[PDB]
Amino acid sequence: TSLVVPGLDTLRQWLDDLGMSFFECDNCQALHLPHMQNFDGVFDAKIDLIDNTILFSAMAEVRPSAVLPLAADLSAINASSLTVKAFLDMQDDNLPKLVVCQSLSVMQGVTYEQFAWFVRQSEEQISMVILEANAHQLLLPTDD
Template sequence: MRWLNAGYIEHYVCENCHGIHFSELQALDGMLESRLFVEHEGSILTSEIEVRPTALLAIMADLTRLNMNYPSLKIFVDIVDDNLPRLIVADYLHTQAGIDQAQFLWIVQHALIATQQLLLEIAELGFLMLEDEPEKPFVAVH
């Protein structure tokens, strides 16, 4: 957390998940959560973007291209029973062999910028489920 402070990356610790949440990224429309989990052998940065159910097929078709355009990120779709579909964006940082502050900040800042660019691209494509629009029921086509 000292390194995040040194890099002027706004964050807070969540009492529920014990993750370090990134305030600036979470404030963006469509972003549900963006956080860093520090583990024994590494750190994982994950973000969750809520997407329209009607865009699910198009997003699934576009996943390969998105993963190629953002090579440092792992992008996949998560669908859980009663929730709207989410695009999960992750970056993993191996730290067991050691890392210095400059390396850590560069990697985290790069991941945050790439995630923000991905969010903007998803919004331009019309895939985001924005807060100010009403939820439309999802109708399965057989």
């Protein structure tokens, strides 16, 4: 197999090699995945390449009355999975966001099937975490 230190161009074609539809604004660096927006509660998901590391991250908006209970359950959520990470991103002017992410290190090179397996295992664990929080009525709906 090949072992690539993948650039942004490498991830763009690898995703199309997997049939994954992606989106990217003009001067930006994130590769947004609209396929992740069919999971209930998922407002946005994107692939990022920072410091030789791939970051599959999805974002869900927390109900303001659920912020404290969800914050207390972050350790149990992070312990529920061997790969997924969950934390609260809360800004003054924004609504509280639940960021769920998983990282793949590409410093020493990765293979295409390593990246493929990483994406779908990420979008399975991220799916189960966000879908479980929406089952607890902790998130806001993604539609009007």
